[PDB]
Structure formats: C-alpha cells, structure tokens
C-alpha cells in the first residue's frame, strides 16, 4: 500500500527562510518560527576564549577585588527588529504580536568532551579535568529592554562598566538596593553576577533559567526537539514584545574550563532559540490627547517668562464658577469638590 | 523638489592648450497639478513609533 488518503488539511507555510520573510503583507494569525541563536559574552578574552571567559581568583576579599572585563560575562541582549503590523493600520482594532512558543536550547557542546587538550590531568592513566562547575542557563526574553536590578556584594570592589555593573555602594547594596535598579539596555554589559531582575518590573519578560550552583555540577541534558515551551499564560502571554523589536536575554555558564593549571575560567556557549509568534488584537488602550501633545508642541518653541508655571505663580486663582442658580446665601463660599461631591468649607 | 542635472559642455580649452571646465545654467518651467490620494497609513504606526 500507498494511498490517496485524505491528506491532512495541514496549515500553510508560505515561505520560510530568515529575515526576508519579515517584510511580508498581512494574513491574520500570522505565525512564525524563529530559529535563532546567540553567541555568548564571557568577558570573552579572545578568539579562543571565544565563548569562554577569563579565569578567576580564588581566595579574596571584597576589598581585594577589581574586576576587569575578561572574565566578566555579561548578559547577551538584542533588539531584534520585528515587523510592523501597524505601518498602515488605521483600524480601531490594533494588532500586536502576542508571543506563542519557544523551544530554545543551548547548543553545540560536543567538543567539550575533551579530557584532553589541557584538561587538567585529574590523575591516573585516565584523563584530564575538562570544564564544569556551576552552570546557569538562563535566558529571559523580554518584550521590554527590561528592568534589571543590580546586585552587588563587595562595595569595596573596583568594578568596570563596559561590563556595566549596577551602580550604588551602600551596605544595603550588599543586600537589596532599591537604587541598583537598572535596566538591561546593553549587550555584554550587565555582568551577570552583578545584575538581577528587577522582576517587579519584569512582568513583560519571561525568564527561565536554572542556575545550577556547585563544584562541577553535572550537565544533564535532554534533546528533545519535539515539544516547545509555550509563551502564553492565563492571559496567554509571555513578554510582550509590544516592541516589534525583540528583547532578547541570556546567561549560559557551562562551567569552567580547568586548565592544566586549574586555570579555571568560565566557559559559556551559544543558545539557539526557536520561537513562535502570533498577531494578537487589542483595543485602544491610550488617548489622543496624550499623543497630541507631542507633535504639536514638539515641532515648536517654549513660552515662559516672569514665573507662573508650576507654583511660581503670579497666577492667581483656580476655582469653579459654573451654573446659575438661585441664591445660596453663602456665595463667597469656598466652593469645593471634595472630589466626589462638593466640599463647602470656610471660617466665616 | 529635487533637482538633478548633468550637462557636459566641456572644458574651455585655454589659449594655452590647457583645458578648464566650463559650466552652464539649467532652466525650468514646470507645469504642475495636485493628485488626491489615499492614506493607508496611520496613527497605529504613530503610536508604535511614538512609543519607539
């Protein structure tokens, strides 16, 4: 057998392939598969410590810490520009992308099975000590160019900033510091150890990561390719890259390659991501006025002289007249509105 | 309105047997009208933009 059996009324891919596809016209749901990936940012010493960091110090003190970039991974970020649905769009329904699946995966290990090439001879007539340690594979995906929140110990450190650390250096910087609130808006700059979600604000990004502390801590994978994680929630949402520009976010500490000197240095590796996108429709959520104020006045001058504005006021009074009514016999009243009703107070 | 022209008249070639560029003016007399068009465009785009 072979057979003209009713061969599934499967969807319609129309084309695929990368970036070119974006440019496209309109087709309702519209939805898409992103096969991306990011390379890591480790403080990447060079072209060999390309995807790996610089090595690290060992018994120190807050005090005894100046960082320099190379060992410093910072999170990897991106604006992926995303199509504009709204280029024409002129309807009172608004379309936006609402974010549907990712199956992403940190990718391409396989060389790292070297127990060889400088992998510190553990001993025996066996091998090396390759990489490993803690690993944190994480990513966050934002809709936003997000709220970070800096985390520091050691405000006796002497930190760089290309590897844009959070600033502020209170005691409390050693615990939460509500001032080390930042925002990732920068490729390899938030060094990872330095920064943390401002998750109170992170609400329009989804992150998942599981930081995996520990000495060598095993990498147990899974390599499925056969079941995504879906970027919906109760309200069916993930980040909202309202931004048709994409805020991309990550950290993937494979662990540390241990040189034969135990020159241990983080090794990071690239992640592949596989994203599923749709067009979601909304309401208006914001008014004309709020907009208008812009054009107008922006393509314009300022007028302010003797001071009125604010409070610096040769301005005088703000009250409410209005109506024509009989005779309340207090009429030089002080006429208010408590806000929801009328407050009527005086001294008289 | 964007205006373009190119018109090689030459080099005035000097008494010398040297050459030197020569240029000339262009004239225009345009006869023009208005075409009424559709916007397809928008606010939507504003807002996103606005936002941007």
Swiss-Prot record, chain A:
Per the UniProt entry, what are the Gene Ontology biological process annotations, in alphabetical order? caveolin-mediated endocytosis of virus by host cell; virion attachment to host cell
Q: Is Phosphoprotein there in the keyword field?
A: yes
Please give the residue positions where the record annotates the modification Phosphothreonine.
324
- Cellular location(s): Virion; Host nucleus
What results from changing residue 157 to T?
A: In strain: MM
Query: What Gene Ontology cellular component terms go with this record?
Result: host cell nucleus; T=7 icosahedral viral capsid
InterPro entries, alphabetized: Capsid_VP1_Polyomavir, dsDNA_vir_gr_I_capsid, Polyomavir_VP1_sf
**Membrane-spanning intervals of the chain:** none
> What result is annotated for mutating residue 287 to L?
In strain: MM
Provide the leader sequence positions. none
What's this protein's function?
Answer: Forms an icosahedral capsid with a T=7 symmetry and a 50 nm diameter. The capsid is composed of 72 pentamers linked to each other by disulfide bonds and associated with VP2 or VP3 proteins. Interacts with gangliosides GT1b and GD1b containing terminal alpha(2-8)-linked sialic acids on the cell surface to provide virion attachment to target cell. This attachment induces virion internalization predominantly through caveolin-mediated endocytosis and traffics to the endoplasmic reticulum.
Task: Describe the subunit structure.
Answer: Homomultimer; disulfide-linked. The virus capsid is composed of 72 icosahedral units, each one composed of five disulfide-linked copies of VP1. Interacts with minor capsid proteins VP2 and VP3.
* Protein name as it appears in the record: Major capsid protein VP1
Q: Which species expresses this protein natively?
A: BK polyomavirus (BKPyV)
**Higher taxonomy:** Viruses, Monodnaviria, Shotokuvirae, Cossaviricota, Papovaviricetes
């Amino acid at each position: 057998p072979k057979k003209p059996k009713e061969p599934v009324q499967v969807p319609k891919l129309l084309i695929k392939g990368g970036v070119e596809v974006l440019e496209v016209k309109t087709g309702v749901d519209a939805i898409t598969e992103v096969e991306c990936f990011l390379n890591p940012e480790m403080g990447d010493p060079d072209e060999n410590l390309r995807g790996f960091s610089l090595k690290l110090s060992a018994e120190n003190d807050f005090s005894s810490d100046s960082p320099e970039r190379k060992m410093l991974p910072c999170y990897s970020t991106a604006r992926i520009p995303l199509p504009n649905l709204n280029e024409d769009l002129t309807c009172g329904n608004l379309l936006m992308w609402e974010a549907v699946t990712v199956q992403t995966e940190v990718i391409g290990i396989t060389s790292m099975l070297n127990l060889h090439a400088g992998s510190q001879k553990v001993h025996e007539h066996g091998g090396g000590k390759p990489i490993q340690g803690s690993n944190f594979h994480f990513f966050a995906v934002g809709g936003e160019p997000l709220e970070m929140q800096g985390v520091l110990m050691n405000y006796r450190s002497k930190y760089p900033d290309g590897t844009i650390t959070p600033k502020n250096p209170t005691a409390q910087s050693q615990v939460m510091n509500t001032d080390h609130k930042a925002y990732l808006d920068k490729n390899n700059a938030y060094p990872v150890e330095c920064w943390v979600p401002d998750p109170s604000r992170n609400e329009n990004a989804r992150y998942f990561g599981t930081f995996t502390g520990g000495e060598n801590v095993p990498p147990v994978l899974h390599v499925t390719n056969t079941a995504t994680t879906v970027l919906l929630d109760e309200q069916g949402v993930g980040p909202l890259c309202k931004a048709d520009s994409l805020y991309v976010s990550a950290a993937d500490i494979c662990g540390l390659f241990t040189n034969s000197s135990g020159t241990q240095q983080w090794r990071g590796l690239a992640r592949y991501f596989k994203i599923r996108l749709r067009k979601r429709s909304v309401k208006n959520p914001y008014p004309i006025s709020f907009l208008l104020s812009d054009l107008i006045n922006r393509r314009t001058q300022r007028v302010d002289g003797q001071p009125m504005y604010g409070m610096e006021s040769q301005v005088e009074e703000v009250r409410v007249f209005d109506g024509t009514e009989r005779l309340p016999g207090d009429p030089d009243m002080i006429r208010y509105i408590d806000k929801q009703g009328q407050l009527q107070t005086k001294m008289l």
